[model samples]
Target chain A: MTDQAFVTLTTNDAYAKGALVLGSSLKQHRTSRRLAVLTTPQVSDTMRKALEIVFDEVITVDILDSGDSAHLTLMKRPELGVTLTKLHCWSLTQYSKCVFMDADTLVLANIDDLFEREELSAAPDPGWPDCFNSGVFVYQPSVETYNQLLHVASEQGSFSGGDQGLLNTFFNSWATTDIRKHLPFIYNLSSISIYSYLPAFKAFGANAKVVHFLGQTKPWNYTYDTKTKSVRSMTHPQFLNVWWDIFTTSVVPLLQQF
Target chain B: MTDQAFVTLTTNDAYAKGALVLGSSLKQHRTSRRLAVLTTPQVSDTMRKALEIVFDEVITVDILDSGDSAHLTLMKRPELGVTLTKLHCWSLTQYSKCVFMDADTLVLANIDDLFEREELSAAPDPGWPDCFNSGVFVYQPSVETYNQLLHVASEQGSFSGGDQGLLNTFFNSWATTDIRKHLPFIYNLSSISIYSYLPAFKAFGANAKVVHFLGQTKPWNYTYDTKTKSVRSMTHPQFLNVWWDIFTTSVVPLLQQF
Candidate 1:
């Protein structure tokens, strides 16, 4: 295949589980694209060994902290806490193109064709479809884009929150220039509340290429809870159950072989 | 009117805001029902005043801490931190029948018809349909059922987490017996993964009678983020944006009235 990669990130062990499972899910679908992950030192050595076995490139990246007030930062918007870490994706110039998938994602099908998309190609944020969900996206790696994102991060500090907001501002033309540039929602399917949003789920659920569990409560929490079959609240999702099934049974065991 | 009420619970101010918004959403649709809220002393009198104006009854209750381990309960799961306080829902026996909605929920339309269903009428969880989402459900208040729940709470603890586990066990017939006891996904409509779960959402987004903002990431947090347009990393749900619009304009203004 061309110099393309399926990139994911993991800042800590909890998220390492997410990234690892995502790696397994990708391998299960049997894709030819290069696989890589951007990880921070917060991940332990043992977890790093586990990750190296799954991702072809287990690259370590810096955790660029946004010194803004904890209250002022984007994580409170219920986001990826160490979002500054996401900016490292633009620096992965080793690959000609890269598709950045959040650690909280699962691949339902092979989405190798995503490499064909140009820079800043992604589905609209379900909040504002025009803006795009930053969780799963396609972009061409570039030093200029990486520096410019940092410049924006320094000057304007992202209009949306962090990387997603900055990326949206940087890719300002994504909204109106060419509708074709916007991939279908199936590419970065965010389903934090997709349960009641049933019609959209029913129509697009099968079409979803990548499933993003976009909230504080993750599938691992549910998997352990489900293993006992006794977690409560309205916190339940079929996707989470499926993800936990893979994470606990398939992916974690792979760590032994690696 | 008969002793039937729409009840919700909140242990503190943050959740009280959710309960208040739910009440306003219910009133905006104009349901001919008594609205009540169960809260804790931690919720300041000022917030209670805000709740009282929105709900016909705002009663303060004690927080029942469920510090139990996952293995000890009827619902074999971990739990909401102070969620055990939700048990007070069963104590409101004055109301012959009631529909319990998690404070994390918003009413999209006139859902008064939920009263027609029997006790424990709720939609199955999106993750495992065999189990119900405790976020929204119809039930009859009974001292007998309440005591049995406490007994189970003391003995088996909770199989799931908090009130959802206790109640699901108390109403054990929910899965096996009467299909009528099963509310359609729309009635209790709780969706955790609202993105790839899009087909269900697109089809039902417009038709949702009640929307449960399940999980920690709420619409309240996003309303402000979207206002600045700086919110980042996976904030989604057009329904949440719409809800926030009503919340910021109507609910926030209503708080000032007090």
Candidate 2:
């Protein structure tokens, strides 16, 4: 099998569930690539085991912090601590190549071809197109790359403050580089609030391949109605419902044991 | 007056509503601070006039961006463009100092005392305790500072990828410099998530200085039952009502003229 992988991180239990479904969704799509998870010690043993059920391997990594920002954020606002773990995605040398998806993302179709793209390949962020959203991206994992990131975090730190900023800093040439590096918006379809841009989303929203649930209404917090087997309420009625469909159809029954 | 002020940005009409109630909520608590709003050209004429009713000076600033992330996001996605406006906060050098609140946030208490703090003062984001959420913060405005941010955007851009990350980068020492710069949780108590620890919220929820509606709910979209004078349905029932109370009493009555 190819040493390529689809990787995700979950620092704690709720996100471990996110990782589970993410893995399930990836596996369901029948990508020839492997699935791996990088999570911190904070995630409970039971949760880690649950993640292991879905993920090929659930690897526990220590928290990686190069500066006061990551250290303090892990201590003060632990919830936002997920951003730091993303820096460690570069540490997965087991897989020569990988697509690191934010645990919050939901994949729609077969994206096995993302492996065809090079490291730092990502879609332009909707907010600031040059700055790519870290929700979903294809990358080559390596120790040297990780150390350089550590160097950046220690000295220059990051611009935006966390992973997206740090990774973007390390991959400074992403914007002006090869056009092939720029994945389509469907690859990492970050939810631009429906309330803010209903018309735009209505126009091309149906074509999204992945859903990056930003702001509020993460699928985790959504109440899944057993009758309809769907999320009760969400931003894009279509994509939000798709995530719910995948979760209920694939991941929920497996999780019901716990 | 203290020459100190409160500032917010609204890139469009809906956020203009958030800016409107944000001002009303600030005033409802009887803050002596002046209120100002920064919005783009696209916000509707009717909405701008409505915002003028509450905000002290509805100054229109051209959308600022570097050829970096903002340019791409604004052009492609268009919806996520407000994030770049965060840079413009430093442009309001007219006030000796100001507290910038995200349009999505609601004021629960008078926090004029925030003016006494220096630049980059903010509560640790609930997710990452070290990196502050840009939702609410105190800072002195300067043209030079704004230009420096521009320089960084052109070159280094933001390490975090957007305004909060960018601001945190320029004020890189916030994590280690002074503890006082870290505002208490009440000053900008972003919803830490409901089920995560409902007990903790029940214990300390009453004293929040500001409420950030994190997920699917917003005061605008939230259906208010006028007869009962309560939000019809929401996650944080109490805080949602507080926002509803202010919106119905203050913002709704004022908008009736339009």
Candidate 3:
């Protein structure tokens, strides 16, 4: 079997559902690579069990166990606690190369091709393009990088107080480095772009391979009218409808069994 | 005299004042390169003479004279009329390489080094990083490239109905072609970034070489208290104050003499 896998992270059941939907989409697209997820203790056993069914391997990660240095860092800056947990993905040395997609992201097409990209490959963020959106990225797992990341988090602290800030700090050269590492916008398309850059969406939205439900409101937060097969209160609900379709057809039935 | 120069454009007297301040700021920074401006017929003769005093060359460009193709394109999509005027920048063959800055932009530091960059080199927009902001950029003047840009505008038309859309479409490979083509964020730091991404601005704002006053509000729109050297109603008035300093000490005196 190929040593490459697709990965995600879930801190709680709410996000675990997002993970479930994400995993279902990956499977739906028939990715040849393995599926893995990093979960915390806060995730419900039922949700964890559901995740186990979809993912080839569901690995549990604890930030507290990242060692004394991280613990001391958390003490000084409690805000970076969640950021450390996300950074734990770098510690997944089991896979030679892994494409890490955030739980809130959904796949519209086969992305097994992502394994071909090198470490730190990601799409530019719509908000600030110089900083790649960490929602989806290709990375090589290494304990050394993980330790170095912790050291950075401990020393300087993230500017935005999130994993994105910490990772962007670690991979500072991403903006001015190899162009191959800069994934196309369609690979990790933000849902907000549909509304914010409507003309761009009208021109290129049809080619989207993945949809990242970024910002405060997520696909789960919306009301999906199963009767009409539409999502309410969404400016552009096309992608939201696709997410719900997979959720109802594939994910919801899997969770009911647990 | 050096063939290379700094270029700016102004459609009206209001923006001519902005261009005057811009040219004055470039002079204040002691740039070795020449300063030039493209003016339209609408600019007042008083402002034109004032511009001539500060700028080495004040060339006049008219959109109506841009040939039948552009005229036909504008007739079909009149929104692109202003964008056509901006595209004329490519026709400045007198300069082997030129650095084009928007009139609303203020130079904090001497940027003669921008001439070293190749055609289409620019900083990413804070609103959408993949698309480089058109506020400041380095380009080589060419008649062929100008015709090509017009053809693209006439055929496909601009997606955003602005110069940015047209240029981004023409230089579609900018996002993924070469890392060196991507100028650092500090080179064209947006005023909006100070309020939008406060953390990033705080971390790197000090390194800003050029400040672009993008959006609906120009520096002229603000009321500056000359006594205290402060600007009113701005979230981060530090840069606003700098713009006013040049306008009062440098540009205003030149205009009064006219």
Candidate 4:
């Protein structure tokens, strides 16, 4: 159980809050696995310390210093700079396997069972079902996989210009190989389901284990009502409130101490 | 060439116009294979006669009488009636293999090579790439396959309440099976590409051999300016002009003779 962990990344203070809440949620559900987060230099000192309280390890990653050759090749595509930072997850060779969840994602339940799945296992993206969403994925940590990802990232360039596009292209066989690799939608349900797919959401929303605040509008972007304990004027209040509940009660107090 | 053919369906006069343009487009592309069309009773007699001229074999299919048991089962869901009618394409046992193109589709180039593909071969739908679009598919004609499709239709019912949904559900392995079964997007490039995937369309639109007007607003819905040779106030005027050009020249003149 100690050899496996749940991983996340935070490039700034805003995402650090997301990482804190996500770590709390995993702990809330009593996961047997450890929690680790990769933080960039931009993340504030206080926020990074707060992350240490919730996460078992707060590993600092500098994409610029790590792979200079790949960075030089990708400097033309500045948008991919953040994507290379995400590739840092594969460098965590200390853990045999890890389930990397995006900072914007909230764990509704313990998903430690994800460690059982093979690398490249992820739920399908709502927008394009064939391309597995990179918001949450199970992967075996390897230095070779990390190097190959950087090679591909610098060479081909991503189609959508993000980690999801880069990861999907590298894991091209994810769509066709083994059925087990296709995690159930409940594992990484996108918030867009409220409108993008209302019927299926109504049928399966309750079963969601992870809620990914996938688009540009993060949960932090929305205003929460403390009186009603719900998010105001949001299409998906049910998910937002769950995020705020943890943020206000657990994460906020921990940050104040620092 | 006699054993291979292109097939289409028209449930009403509006779609019969679509069938006429589609069949004429195939003929214009110099397809060596035969052209076939399935017409419902709702199609006007004049339009049916017009279809007969362009199509090598004009077959009448009354879904109301064909699958009585399946009809009774699906009567609760009237929307699937059209889907059942589309299943009739599999019953054209006279042709060993047929490429089923939706009435609203237009052939930009000769795609008789589609006959080389096996049954259940189709391009990915733009809306949901995982589910193969039923608009254009290469299928082998077999009474047994037709009977099994009817059985699945009556028992399971379709998720999207259309042939695309039902056929995708029946041919579930298309997503994970042989790569050969997955036809390239150029074979059935959707009109949605103008907005849905503009970058990719810009990069590869020139290679498109077939254009499927997949959504509600089809070419007939748009008015074309003959003087300018363009469609007005439409996102995809390039495709609309081709449909209109064929309609005004070949289809309309034949309808006048009828």
Taking chain B only, the TM-score of every model is: 0.86, 0.89, 0.95, 0.95
Which candidate number has the best DockQ?
A: 3
Can you list each candidate's DockQ?
0.02, 0.02, 0.59, 0.19
DockQ of 4: 0.19
List the RMSD of every prediction in angstroms. Answer: 16.1, 15.1, 2.0, 3.9
Of candidates 3 and 2, the better by TM-score = 3
What is candidate 3's CA lDDT for residue B107? 89
Candidate 2 or 1, higher TM-score: 2
Q: What digit string (tens of lDDT, one per residue) describes model 1 on residues B53-83?
A: 8899987665333442222332442353354
Error of 2 at B193 (Å): 3.8
> Each candidate: how many clashes?
56, 26, 1, 0
Q: Rank the candidates by DockQ, best first.
A: 3, 4, 2, 1
List model 1 lDDT by residue over A177-227, tens digit each. 554466766677777536645533553366677888877677767625645
Error of 3 at B258 (Å): 2.7
Q: Name the lDDT value of residue A142 in candidate 4.
A: 96
The digit string of per-residue lDDT tens for model 4 on B15-123 reads 9999999999898989899999988888888998888789999988776774554466457667787787788788889999999999999999988788788988987
Clashing pairs in 3: A129-B129
Top candidate on lDDT is 3
Candidate closer to the true structure by TM-score (higher is better), 3 or 4: 3
In angstroms, how far off is B116's CA in candidate 1?
A: 0.7
If the candidates were sorted by their TM-score against the true structure, best first, what order would they fall in?
3, 4, 2, 1
